[PDB]
Every structure is written in structure tokens, then in C-alpha cells.
Curated annotation (Swiss-Prot):
Organism annotation: Gallus gallus
Residue ranges of the TM segments: none
Record's protein name: Lysozyme C
Superkingdom to which the source organism belongs: Eukaryota
Subcellular location: Secreted
Substrates-to-products reaction catalysed: Hydrolysis of (1->4)-beta-linkages between N-acetylmuramic acid and N-acetyl-D-glucosamine residues in a peptidoglycan and between N-acetyl-D-glucosamine residues in chitodextrins
Gene: LYZ
Length: 129
């Protein structure tokens, strides 16, 4: 599924991401945009051999099990394939564990480089939330 800008803002708001650990909704929509371009089916292989899955590109090294990331952890206790679904529940719930692990949204390389220090509120502007 490819989400529209506001459709995803509402999906994430409904799932309790708005101001989760102090990260406003704008931050989450911005990260989703530059990580996946709002496509739940996005996959990217890292150089180490792990793969990033879905709308927030959760890494198979730490967070999910894809059966081919050797010696890796599964800290969200989920099949990586559960993060490609048009239902963003697994991605959101696992995202909540990632952002709580001490480094906040600095976990997301695209957020840190393209969303941090910008007017993220613009990513929800004109949405009925
Ligand atoms: Cl915001
Ligand atoms: Cl990366
Ligand atoms: Cl980046």
C-alpha cells in the first residue's frame, strides 16, 4: 500500500504516535516519507547483510527476523514480512520500541538528516486529524 500524506498522519495518530516520547506527528510522517516514500512494501538491503522493511524501514539486524540475517536479534518478536502489510500496526508498535531504546528518532538515518531541525509540522498541514 502507498499511503497519502494525511491518510498516514491519521493512521499513525489513531495508533498513538502523535507526541509519542515527545515526537510530534509531523516527525513520524516526515521519517515515513524519506524512508519508504509512504510505501508499506519498501525493502532495502544494507551492506552488512540485514534488510530494512516497510514504511519506517525497520532493520532485520535488531528488530525483526527475515530468516537470512545471521546471528541477528528479533527485539520486536515479529516476522519482518509483517512490516510490509497495508495495516501499519506491527510497524507502529515496533517503531514505539525502537524510539524508546534511548536514541529516540536518531535511530532513523533519514529522519536525522532530512527531518531533524526542520518545520515537520508542514507534513500534517491541511490534514483533518
Ligand atoms: Cl508536528
Ligand atoms: Cl541506512
Ligand atoms: Cl539520509
Amino acid at each position: 500500500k502507498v499511503f497519502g500524506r494525511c491518510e498516514l498522519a491519521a493512521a499513525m495518530k489513531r495508533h498513538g504516535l502523535d507526541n509519542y516520547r515527545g515526537y510530534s506527528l509531523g516527525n513520524w510522517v516526515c521519517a515515513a516519507k524519506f524512508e519508504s516514500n509512504f510505501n508499506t512494501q519498501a525493502t532495502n538491503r544494507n551492506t552488512d547483510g540485514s534488510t530494512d522493511y516497510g514504511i519506517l524501514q525497520i532493520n532485520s539486524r535488531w528488530w525483526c527476523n527475515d530468516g537470512r540475517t545471521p546471528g541477528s536479534r528479533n527485539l520486536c518478536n515479529i516476522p519482518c514480512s509483517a512490516l510490509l502489510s497495508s495495516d501499519i500496526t506491527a510497524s507502529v508498535n515496533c517503531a514505539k520500541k525502537i524510539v524508546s531504546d534511548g536514541n529516540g528518532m536518531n535511530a532513523w538515518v533519514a529522519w536525522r538528516n532530512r527531518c531533524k531541525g526542520t518545520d515537520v509540522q508542514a507534513w500534517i498541514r491541511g490534514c483533518r486529524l
